[PDB]
Amino acid sequence: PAIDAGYVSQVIGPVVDVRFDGELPSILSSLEVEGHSVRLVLEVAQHMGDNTVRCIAMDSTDGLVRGQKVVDTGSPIKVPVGRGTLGRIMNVIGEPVDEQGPIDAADIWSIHREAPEFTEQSTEQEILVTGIKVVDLLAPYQRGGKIGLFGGAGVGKTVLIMELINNVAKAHGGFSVFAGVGERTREGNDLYREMIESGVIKLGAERGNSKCTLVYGQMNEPPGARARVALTGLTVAEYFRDIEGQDVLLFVDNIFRFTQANSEVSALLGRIPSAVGYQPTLATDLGGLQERITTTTKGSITSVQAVYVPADDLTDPAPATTFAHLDATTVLSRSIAELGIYPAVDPLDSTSRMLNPNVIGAEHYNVARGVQKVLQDYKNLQDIIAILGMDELSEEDKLTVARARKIQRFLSQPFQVAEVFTGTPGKYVDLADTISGF
Amino acid sequence: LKLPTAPLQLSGTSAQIATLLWQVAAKENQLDKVQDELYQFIELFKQHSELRRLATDPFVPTLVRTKIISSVLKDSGASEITKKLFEALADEGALSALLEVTVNYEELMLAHK
Amino acid sequence: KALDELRKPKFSSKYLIQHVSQKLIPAVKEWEKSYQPPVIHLGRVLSVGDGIARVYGLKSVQAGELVCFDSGVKGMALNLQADHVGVVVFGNDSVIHQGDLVYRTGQIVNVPIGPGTLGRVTDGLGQPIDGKGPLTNVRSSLVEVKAPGIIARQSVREPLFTGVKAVDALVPIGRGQRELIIGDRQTGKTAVAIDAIIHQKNCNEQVPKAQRVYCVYVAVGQKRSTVAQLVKLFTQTGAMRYTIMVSATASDAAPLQFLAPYSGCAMAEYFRDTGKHGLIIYDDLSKQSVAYRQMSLLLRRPPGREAFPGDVFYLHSRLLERAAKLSKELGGGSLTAFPVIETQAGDVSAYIATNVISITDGQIFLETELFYKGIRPALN
Amino acid sequence: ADAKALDELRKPKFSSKYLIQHVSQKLIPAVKEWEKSYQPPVIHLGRVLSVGDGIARVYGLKSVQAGELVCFDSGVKGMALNLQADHVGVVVFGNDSVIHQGDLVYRTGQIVNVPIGPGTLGRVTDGLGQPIDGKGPLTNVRSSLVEVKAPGIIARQSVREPLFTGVKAVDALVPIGRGQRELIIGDRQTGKTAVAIDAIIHQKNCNEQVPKAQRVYCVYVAVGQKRSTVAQLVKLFTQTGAMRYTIMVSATASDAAPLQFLAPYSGCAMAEYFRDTGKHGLIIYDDLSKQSVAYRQMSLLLRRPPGREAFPGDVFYLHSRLLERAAKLSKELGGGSLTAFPVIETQAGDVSAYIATNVISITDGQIFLETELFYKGIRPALN
């Protein structure tokens, strides 16, 4: 009984070192600290040598003494997966935090996997209409692709991702998963009460007819919890994709908090910092997580992730690494939002792999490239109109300015989730009504 | 609380161990009895490949190494200053510092005479 | 031949001489008369400097535990290491020496909370500075409490009237909200925050008992004269009856300014957890982050953007998530936060400014151009 | 503390034997009482001291070479990068979750090598040569080192054959050569890969037209990309028929950092088979800006001191020794060629970036792709 029990060697914030006398746990293995005030789960991150492992705590470390017994579970963090997680809120370690009792698990799956292999990749570029004019025209969304919403703290990435829940999750036949990673706990209670009245989440005996699983690791949690709750959110979505064969929706409200919480622990893991202050393993931590969210041959995950740009800097290394992992990026702009245009999508910064004439048809493609042509031509005149006014332009360029000032109002659209604070009702626009309107 | 003054001031982290070893053995009047015990253990590292393995091999655990030494250093007429120093270096893996505690003890001893 | 591997040594534990000197002074036959260095619940300072004391021993100390030095100045066990304890000091480090005795108090860092904190001016650690005696009708609770979860909260339904016309009409604020007051220096940031505290004194005399709002004003990095001129304002108005005043001024230590928002939030979380309604104001939210940047760089942690640490988002996200409107099975009490962020030249794309914007619910942008055109309050 | 009296201490000066005569008969029964916890001593094998973040510090391994393939007992490969006095820093070719402290490390004897030959022609391999396309192992192939030095002055000749790309913005304004290294540089989603894919597709149209020796064998190196983008690209190369002449090396974003670092060298060694045998190669190092980030991760975790944007100091030599292997050989060496298309992604058009200005100074030409010309209808967005 003395073996298979390590003692806490040293505590540096969220990083705990545990010395195992007999046998060391594997890397990514989960541990349990005896006698804490809450259930403190440590996950082994590094073997430091001299029989010590280096771990990241999933809860707060305040109250840890350097002799405390730590038990090895012999496995990574295992969370409940299956249809019994539908309509339930789980935290990072799979505990139910919705006060509805224990989770009726079909299985207990580890949160750590390899990405699905090269032979298990699907090449099926089918469009997913969202009812949003700037999304359906200029950067259309793939039905089984990765989707990024890049935003700068107050530009409307959460109102856009709630409108995507309002538009495409009701029309979807599969199961939704919401991974709330490092966001406001008020928004996690707002989404829970909105999904209960909408019948997306049912409580009690009707729980089996729920279509959404909430996983919440919000910004009141320590950085160890916010660094692994995205991995918990994939594991529920990976079960419906692999085992159930379903088409899964995965909404990850701010995936940047996965990268930011890995930088808060990397200062205490004894690493030399990379560029601006992030960890040296930025591309392989994000690349290890983002490559598990794919459409395979036995299931599709349509993932919509919000990405926070830290100081409205798109050249920051955490948004810049995320740009290569996506099929459709929707870069939202702070300066578009100051004009009052909502959603504040930059039309000359949002791209998609679906905007190809052999995929969406040559009639839809030629309109989007014509909208981007006169919006770029209006941007080329932006300083001549500033320092000299519109009276100095040509009569063929004042037609370019007036048309581009019209379509950038026509890319604006009222949302069904913004009707509470704007008063105007929401508008769902069909795809053919957008191509004909533009 | 009061310790005798060392005859000369020396360097760090292996000369202040020998400085502390000199100030403790002067309180016991045991200087030349703990000086030759240093050269005795040096001969013990030249002989055995299993006693210099505790000084150099990083895979010998810290609970094995302090229980090889303290089960070898039962009383045997050895000094209590030696039997309490070499288990403090064994508890921290500093048995390879014995070759510079000895040199800095030689310079403390000839400055004493 | 066999001694070539020992000609230069290899060891960890930079404080190597401290463990040897705890094993050689008992080998002296005279110093076995209980000449023992206390190491279980006591400790000796190894190094001290720029607000960080390294302490040998303290083998039974907890992480985050409030320890006390023999000088009387208290500290916090921050880094528990294999051979020492890193302690951040909650006062001036000039009264701490090498070899000073450090005592653990037995508990995590706590402030006195309760009804005895109303009317009292307080430093960032709990002890009163207004010179009216100790806190009487009070009890100690932790400054570092995990925020209430998803089920513990409910939707913000009841309004918190600020008393400002441009606020209560245009930027309406409910009980349980976090509203940022952001703008340049001298644009009316406090003019909005202290009109809210004064207006709660007028409203508390007309609403029933369970609808009153108790205010807490945390002053981080302010002048001590402007704190003293504000207590005179709250006394001549009568707002001090419902107001707690926490103040870590510009001369106070950087761990005291780091902890004064968390100290004042725990004093404000007494009213939230008991069904009453609280109103917490962190004047100059950026200041606290500058004081936390000072502690992080003096702990030699790797700086990030604008030399801030990586957990400077978690500095403010952990603090502001504790302002919540609780559910009906938790008393139904609320806590309303007003963090204040000072911007430079109206730049709101800064690191700490965009941090708190992505934490709080709304913002009150106070423009510097309208403030000098006579439009006061200069609400953008 | 000087080494003169310290090496004098090698000579015996004990002058008494009341411990040397006592503990010598007491040590071997004391060692044998704790021999259950003794791991066996290691000399020419290795043993893991510490493992973490893809770096194993390995005790032992006395006779390993620098840059040598080592193999842990769990089957995962490694590479001895910095040989230090007491340990060996090993970068792990895969997941380091299967490596523990105390695992035996085995020296394989060989410097890192990949399979080269005609058997790779048509396969999708990883950053070390193992095929990931699910079509069995590589047959009709042989092993060659990934760190061959570039051909010198006397081995080369002047670049005279065209190698058209099929893009008339390129082939009229910025003409490529047969042994020329031409950079495709631009921002994100400006058509960098497009210019390189249209080059590979155009060689399939030309290889069914030229007499058997002007045929160009393409190699696409996909560094740091996601795995579904690579599968979207084999589907394009198979439905066109360009996969008959194309090798694809793909160390994706989920792979380890020493696999993405080594995949431009793994793909260049496969493309050097055609250069060294009288044929003509065409290599595309897509996201060479992502190899430098993978190389930065290894060196920062091997605790090498950082430089500009925390990159290593020798990150110029990372790309200069890679691209100089793309040459046009002389008639006494077969006359074969190898032309490189490295791809560098800039941030907001900042050409003055650190990795961007290195590869501009290494490569012959540049193909600048601007994001503001891209939205004016000019596709390809050639500046």
Ligand SMILES: Nc1ncnc2c1ncn2[C@@H]1O[C@H](COP(=O)(O)OP(=O)(O)OP(=O)(O)O)[C@@H](O)[C@H]1O
């Ligand atoms: N509504 C108002 N009408 C008139 N004067 C006002 C009003 N609001 C604020 N002021 C005045 O404007 C000045 C700004 O002081 P205040 O403390 O409100 O600004 P601040 O943004 O907190 O400045 P600092 O950065 O120095 O803390 C004061 O002289 C104050 O009395």
Ligand SMILES: Nc1ncnc2c1ncn2[C@@H]1O[C@H](COP(=O)(O)OP(=O)(O)OP(=O)(O)O)[C@@H](O)[C@H]1O
């Ligand atoms: N000549 C062209 N005509 C039309 N569309 C083009 C052309 N070249 C590229 N595109 C389109 O531009 C987009 C970006 O092209 P590409 O994938 O080559 O860019 P990239 O710089 O590699 O982007 P990323 O940074 O995402 O890898 C795609 O939608 C592609 O189809």
Ligand SMILES: Nc1ncnc2c1ncn2[C@@H]1O[C@H](COP(=O)(O)OP(=O)(O)O)[C@@H](O)[C@H]1O
């Ligand atoms: N679709 C929209 N319609 C109207 N206003 C919007 C819209 N999206 C965002 N906004 C405005 O911008 C703010 C951004 O809020 P939110 O989306 O929660 O921020 P963040 O992008 O930081 O998550 C809203 O409070 C609102 O004032």
Ligand SMILES: [Mg+2]
């Ligand atoms: Mg948000």
Ligand SMILES: [Mg+2]
């Ligand atoms: Mg003020």
Ligand SMILES: [Mg+2]
């Ligand atoms: Mg590309």
